[PDB]
Write a protein that holds these residues in place. Structure first.
Motif, PDB file in Angstrom:
ATOM      1  N   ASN A   1     -31.371  18.585-100.684  1.00 17.33           N
ATOM      2  CA  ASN A   1     -32.804  18.973-100.417  1.00 17.33           C
ATOM      3  C   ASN A   1     -32.970  19.840 -99.165  1.00 17.33           C
ATOM      4  OD1 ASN A   1     -32.919  16.529-102.206  1.00 17.33           O
ATOM      5  ND2 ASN A   1     -35.104  17.160-102.292  1.00 17.33           N
ATOM      6  N   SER A   2     -33.997  20.693 -99.161  1.00 23.37           N
ATOM      7  CA  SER A   2     -34.427  21.412 -97.980  1.00 23.37           C
ATOM      8  C   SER A   2     -34.656  20.458 -96.782  1.00 23.37           C
ATOM      9  CB  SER A   2     -35.750  22.157 -98.315  1.00 23.37           C
ATOM     10  OG  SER A   2     -36.224  22.925 -97.198  1.00 23.37           O
ATOM     11  N   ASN A   3     -34.440  20.987 -95.572  1.00 22.17           N
ATOM     12  CA  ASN A   3     -34.638  20.282 -94.299  1.00 22.17           C
ATOM     13  C   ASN A   3     -35.940  20.639 -93.610  1.00 22.17           C
ATOM     14  OD1 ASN A   3     -31.936  19.586 -94.719  1.00 22.17           O
ATOM     15  ND2 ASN A   3     -31.168  21.234 -93.348  1.00 22.17           N
ATOM     16  N   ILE A   4     -36.856  21.348 -94.325  1.00 20.82           N
ATOM     17  CA  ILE A   4     -38.185  21.622 -93.807  1.00 20.82           C
ATOM     18  C   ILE A   4     -39.227  21.318 -94.903  1.00 20.82           C
ATOM     19  CG2 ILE A   4     -37.401  23.211 -91.970  1.00 20.82           C
ATOM     20  CD1 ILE A   4     -38.289  25.557 -93.709  1.00 20.82           C
ATOM     21  N   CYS A   5     -40.391  20.893 -94.481  1.00 21.06           N
ATOM     22  CA  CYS A   5     -41.598  20.739 -95.372  1.00 21.06           C
ATOM     23  C   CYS A   5     -41.955  22.032 -96.107  1.00 21.06           C
ATOM     24  CB  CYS A   5     -42.739  20.193 -94.577  1.00 21.06           C
ATOM     25  SG  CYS A   5     -44.283  19.995 -95.583  1.00 21.06           S
ATOM     26  N   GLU A   6     -42.137  21.925 -97.436  1.00 21.48           N
ATOM     27  CA  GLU A   6     -42.357  23.045 -98.275  1.00 21.48           C
ATOM     28  C   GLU A   6     -43.706  23.717 -97.888  1.00 21.48           C
ATOM     29  OE1 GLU A   6     -40.257  24.037-100.353  1.00 21.48           O
ATOM     30  OE2 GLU A   6     -41.192  25.254-101.840  1.00 21.48           O
ATOM     31  N   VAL A   7     -44.624  22.928 -97.426  1.00 25.05           N
ATOM     32  CA  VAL A   7     -46.031  23.364 -97.153  1.00 25.05           C
ATOM     33  C   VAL A   7     -46.153  24.000 -95.757  1.00 25.05           C
ATOM     34  CG1 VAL A   7     -48.471  22.714 -97.057  1.00 25.05           C
ATOM     35  CG2 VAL A   7     -46.922  21.578 -98.698  1.00 25.05           C
ATOM     36  N   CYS A   8     -45.776  23.237 -94.725  1.00 26.09           N
ATOM     37  CA  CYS A   8     -45.963  23.739 -93.312  1.00 26.09           C
ATOM     38  C   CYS A   8     -44.697  24.292 -92.652  1.00 26.09           C
ATOM     39  CB  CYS A   8     -46.536  22.676 -92.503  1.00 26.09           C
ATOM     40  SG  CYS A   8     -45.351  21.333 -92.122  1.00 26.09           S
ATOM     41  N   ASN A   9     -43.570  24.181 -93.316  1.00 18.76           N
ATOM     42  CA  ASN A   9     -42.324  24.785 -92.871  1.00 18.76           C
ATOM     43  C   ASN A   9     -41.766  24.208 -91.587  1.00 18.76           C
ATOM     44  OD1 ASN A   9     -43.974  27.334 -94.278  1.00 18.76           O
ATOM     45  ND2 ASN A   9     -41.938  26.936 -94.955  1.00 18.76           N
ATOM     46  N   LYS A  10     -42.175  22.986 -91.224  1.00 20.57           N
ATOM     47  CA  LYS A  10     -41.643  22.266 -90.068  1.00 20.57           C
ATOM     48  C   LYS A  10     -40.736  21.131 -90.559  1.00 20.57           C
ATOM     49  CE  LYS A  10     -44.076  24.341 -86.789  1.00 20.57           C
ATOM     50  NZ  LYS A  10     -44.478  25.570 -87.497  1.00 20.57           N
ATOM     51  N   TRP A  11     -39.830  20.685 -89.674  1.00 22.86           N
ATOM     52  CA  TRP A  11     -39.097  19.470 -89.862  1.00 22.86           C
ATOM     53  C   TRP A  11     -39.971  18.314 -89.473  1.00 22.86           C
ATOM     54  CZ3 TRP A  11     -36.542  16.286 -86.050  1.00 22.86           C
ATOM     55  CH2 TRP A  11     -35.681  15.379 -86.610  1.00 22.86           C
ATOM     56  N   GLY A  12     -39.423  17.110 -89.700  1.00 22.64           N
ATOM     57  CA  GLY A  12     -40.020  15.889 -89.270  1.00 22.64           C
ATOM     58  C   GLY A  12     -39.627  14.759 -90.225  1.00 22.64           C
ATOM     59  N   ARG A  13     -40.509  13.803 -90.399  1.00 20.23           N
ATOM     60  CA  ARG A  13     -40.375  12.713 -91.404  1.00 20.23           C
ATOM     61  C   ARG A  13     -40.696  13.283 -92.797  1.00 20.23           C
ATOM     62  NH1 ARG A  13     -38.267   9.905 -94.674  1.00 20.23           N
ATOM     63  NH2 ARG A  13     -39.092   7.842 -95.228  1.00 20.23           N
ATOM     64  N   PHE A  15     -40.062  13.511 -97.061  1.00 21.62           N
ATOM     65  CA  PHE A  15     -39.792  12.818 -98.340  1.00 21.62           C
ATOM     66  C   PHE A  15     -39.237  13.847 -99.320  1.00 21.62           C
ATOM     67  CE2 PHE A  15     -42.888  10.685 -95.851  1.00 21.62           C
ATOM     68  CZ  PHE A  15     -42.596   9.335 -96.010  1.00 21.62           C
ATOM     69  N   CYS A  16     -38.137  13.558 -99.970  1.00 19.17           N
ATOM     70  CA  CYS A  16     -37.429  14.513-100.743  1.00 19.17           C
ATOM     71  C   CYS A  16     -37.746  14.354-102.216  1.00 19.17           C
ATOM     72  CB  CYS A  16     -35.912  14.365-100.545  1.00 19.17           C
ATOM     73  SG  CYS A  16     -35.328  14.896 -98.899  1.00 19.17           S
ATOM     74  N   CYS A  17     -37.875  15.472-102.940  1.00 21.60           N
ATOM     75  CA  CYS A  17     -38.117  15.394-104.382  1.00 21.60           C
ATOM     76  C   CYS A  17     -36.781  14.961-105.043  1.00 21.60           C
ATOM     77  CB  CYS A  17     -38.534  16.752-104.958  1.00 21.60           C
ATOM     78  SG  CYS A  17     -38.915  16.577-106.712  1.00 21.60           S
ATOM     79  N   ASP A  18     -36.863  14.084-106.044  1.00 20.33           N
ATOM     80  CA  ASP A  18     -35.646  13.747-106.829  1.00 20.33           C
ATOM     81  C   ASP A  18     -35.243  14.756-107.899  1.00 20.33           C
ATOM     82  OD1 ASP A  18     -34.593  11.507-105.504  1.00 20.33           O
ATOM     83  OD2 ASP A  18     -36.420  10.396-106.040  1.00 20.33           O
ATOM     84  N   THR A  19     -36.148  15.639-108.322  1.00 22.33           N
ATOM     85  CA  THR A  19     -35.871  16.531-109.398  1.00 22.33           C
ATOM     86  C   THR A  19     -35.838  17.954-109.025  1.00 22.33           C
ATOM     87  OG1 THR A  19     -38.240  16.227-110.036  1.00 22.33           O
ATOM     88  CG2 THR A  19     -36.598  14.844-111.072  1.00 22.33           C
ATOM     89  N   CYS A  20     -36.057  18.248-107.735  1.00 24.01           N
ATOM     90  CA  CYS A  20     -35.912  19.590-107.202  1.00 24.01           C
ATOM     91  C   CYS A  20     -35.569  19.424-105.699  1.00 24.01           C
ATOM     92  CB  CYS A  20     -37.161  20.506-107.426  1.00 24.01           C
ATOM     93  SG  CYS A  20     -38.516  20.302-106.215  1.00 24.01           S
ATOM     94  N   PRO A  21     -35.116  20.506-105.068  1.00 21.89           N
ATOM     95  CA  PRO A  21     -34.689  20.413-103.678  1.00 21.89           C
ATOM     96  C   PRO A  21     -35.808  20.472-102.632  1.00 21.89           C
ATOM     97  CG  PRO A  21     -34.159  22.583-104.549  1.00 21.89           C
ATOM     98  CD  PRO A  21     -34.978  21.866-105.583  1.00 21.89           C
ATOM     99  N   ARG A  22     -37.065  20.511-103.046  1.00 18.38           N
ATOM    100  CA  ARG A  22     -38.130  20.539-102.028  1.00 18.38           C
ATOM    101  C   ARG A  22     -38.339  19.252-101.299  1.00 18.38           C
ATOM    102  NH1 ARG A  22     -40.021  23.291-106.672  1.00 18.38           N
ATOM    103  NH2 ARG A  22     -40.690  25.418-106.226  1.00 18.38           N
TER     104      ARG A  22
END
Ligand SMILES: [Zn+2]
Ligand SMILES: [Zn+2]
Ligand SMILES: [Zn+2]
Length: 178
Positions: A1-13, A15-22
């Protein structure tokens, strides 16, 4: 999975999608990332499933028919996704929280509106038709254009409205025209 939030593009806490890398912050995803659910599938994945179960859903539609649809679960989801696509643009920051209006030569709108208010309204099931959601979204940008008049800041409203309208046409498969 990606290491940044798909929406705001920041790291943090995240949650990873199980069916895609977002990945998502809890309250960046819409709806907010669900408590349990293993596996979990993001809104991108849930929208792709709708399309895959009903391929004809991608044929062109008239806007007037889309707006009159009742907010059954699939349309609720589509509006949530469209709202999230607007938050995905960084310029959404200007329209997220409750605005205030004190500018010489202008008067505030009669009905103020903002993204977080639309987000609450969706969460609370306050819209009975697609039209209600779309009218509040368009009101955000119309209020902005009217209040800022000839200031060049008016352009931020045009920009984020364009993101809304392109995504509306994609998600609800609006018939393409010149
Ligand atoms: Zn985020
Ligand atoms: Zn996903
Ligand atoms: Zn089908």
């Amino acid at each position: 999975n990606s290491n940044i939030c798909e929406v705001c593009n920041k790291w943090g806490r995240l949650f990873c999608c199980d069916t895609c890398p977002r990945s998502f912050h809890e309250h960046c995803h819409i709806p907010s990332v669900e408590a349990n659910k293993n596996p979990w599938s993001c809104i991108f994945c849930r929208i792709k499933t709708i399309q895959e179960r009903c391929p004809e859903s991608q044929s062109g539609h008239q806007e007037s028919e889309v707006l009159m649809r009742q907010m059954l679960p699939e349309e609720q989801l589509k509006c949530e996704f469209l709202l999230l696509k607007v938050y995905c643009d960084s310029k959404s920051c200007f329209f997220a929280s409750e605005p205030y209006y004190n500018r010489e030569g202008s008067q505030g709108p009669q009905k103020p509106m903002w993204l977080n208010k639309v987000k609450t309204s969706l969460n609370e099931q306050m819209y009975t038709r697609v039209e209600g959601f779309v009218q509040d979204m368009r009101l955000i940008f119309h209020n902005h254009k009217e209040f800022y008049r000839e200031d060049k800041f008016t352009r931020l409203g045009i920009q984020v409205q364009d993101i809304f309208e392109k995504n509306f046409r994609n998600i609800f498969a609006i018939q393409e025209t010149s």
